């Protein structure tokens, strides 16, 4: 349930994302930490300040992982295995949180890709992100 129409749209948006990916990724986190403090809880060792090179640094990682998923869009479960493990077993993130992070990514994607950010597209990304998350928590259910 990532129809082609869907994959395409995803592709394009992320397409238009390019290099900004890192900063965008960073953007969503800060947005997330700021809008949902409770999530800071997983980043104790972190500098969760307005310009953390850590936060900068993580944003890239996340994005990089997002790009990669985009790329193996029909093999996520596989392209994401390692991450799924880290997230379920080692970090044990309350599944609830994935909903938050993804809402933050969208919001960011919208404020940066107005022209692309359309209904059809908004719907597609959401589904995408939904999947990525699903996969990231498959280690629970």
């Amino acid at each position: 349930v990532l129809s082609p129409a869907d994959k395409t749209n995803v592709k394009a948006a992320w397409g238009k994302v390019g290099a900004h990916a890192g900063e965008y990724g960073a953007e969503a986190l800060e947005r997330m930490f700021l809008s949902f403090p409770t999530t800071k809880t997983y980043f104790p060792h972190f500098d969760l300040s307005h310009g953390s090179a850590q936060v900068k640094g993580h944003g890239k990682k996340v994005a990089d992982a997002l790009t990669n998923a985009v790329a193996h869009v029909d093999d996520m479960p596989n392209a994401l295995s390692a991450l799924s493990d880290l997230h379920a077993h080692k970090l044990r993130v309350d599944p609830v949180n994935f909903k938050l992070l993804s809402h933050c990514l969208l919001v960011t994607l919208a404020a940066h890709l107005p022209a692309e950010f359309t209904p059809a597209v908004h719907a597609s990304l959401d589904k995408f992100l939904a999947s990525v998350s699903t996969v990231l928590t498959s280690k629970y259910r």
Binding site: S35, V107, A110, A111, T118, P119
Partner: protein, 146 residues
């Protein structure tokens, strides 16, 4: 909700830049597109067949106005959100039986829509303030569920 002043301000500020006749329908529209099961409530509206269809339905645009309006009395009454939204709560819970999760969804999209129009202006801290309000609002509508 609570908010700081400079919080309560910037919400209020930005809200000022909001084209009312539009935002409501963008929001309500996108909801019926991204979370299609919500259409069940709006069956009478007409063609929801496609995004464009939904994005252009006039019952959809018109109702959106009504909705954004409620957000407006709400913005003016950040404390008494409870009381503010009380009649709506009955309507929504008691008569319509909408599931509360659906209010979080609606608010969340209003946020994507705000982000959508304001771009760089809709900074993280603005979203955060805005996040509070949407939540306050959601709660308030869910009251009669409690």
């Amino acid at each position: 909700v609570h908010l700081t002043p400079e919080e309560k301000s910037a919400v209020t500020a930005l809200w000022g830049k909001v084209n009312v006749d539009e935002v409501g329908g963008e929001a309500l529209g996108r909801l019926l597109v991204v979370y299609p099961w919500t259409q069940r409530f709006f069956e009478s509206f007409g063609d929801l067949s496609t995004p464009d269809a939904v994005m252009g339905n006039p019952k959809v645009k018109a109702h959106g106005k009504k909705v954004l309006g409620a957000f407006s009395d709400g913005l003016a009454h950040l404390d008494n959100l409870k009381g503010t939204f009380a009649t709506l709560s009955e309507l929504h819970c008691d008569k319509l039986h909408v599931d509360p999760e659906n209010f979080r969804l609606l608010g969340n999209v209003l946020v994507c829509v705000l982000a959508h129009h304001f771009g760089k202006e809709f900074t993280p801290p603005v979203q955060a303030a805005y996040q509070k309000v949407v939540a306050g609002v959601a709660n308030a509508l869910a009251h009669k569920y409690h």
